[PDB]
Design a binder for this molecule. Structure first.
Ligand code: ZN
Ligand code: ZN
Ligand code: ZN
Ligand code: ZN
Ligand code: ZN
Lengths: 49, 27, 50
């Protein structure tokens, strides 16, 4: 449902998480945004597990 | 489904706002 | 700068990119959203490569 999505987004701090990645994205301004975000989350992933 | 996408847009525009704000605080 | 960031977001449809990523996130609601975002962008990087 929609409510489960809103809830998930809040519970898992999704908004700040995404925002932080875009702020980095805006500093780098890469020619390859996808590759950058991939590398960005790969780094955060490695400290997730 | 359209409910979902509508909500995703709202949230994305929220993030874009907070991003612009944080980008004024830094430079 | 702040204007360079605004420009970049517009020119590279970053807002729509977030929207799509959130749509995915809410469909999956992964145990581990970072791992999921990694794979999601990895997949999109591969599209934009070949
Ligand atoms: Zn359910
Ligand atoms: Zn570009
Ligand atoms: Zn190049
Ligand atoms: Zn400059
Ligand atoms: Zn550009």
């Amino acid at each position: 449902s929609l409510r489960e999505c809103e809830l998930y987004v809040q519970k898992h701090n999704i908004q700040a998480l995404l925002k932080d990645s875009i702020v980095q994205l805006c500093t780098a301004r890469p020619e390859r945004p996808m590759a950058f975000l991939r590398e960005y989350f790969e780094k955060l992933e490695k400290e997730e597990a | 489904d359209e409910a979902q996408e509508e909500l995703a847009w709202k949230i994305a525009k929220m993030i874009v706002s907070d991003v612009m704000q944080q980008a004024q605080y830094d430079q």
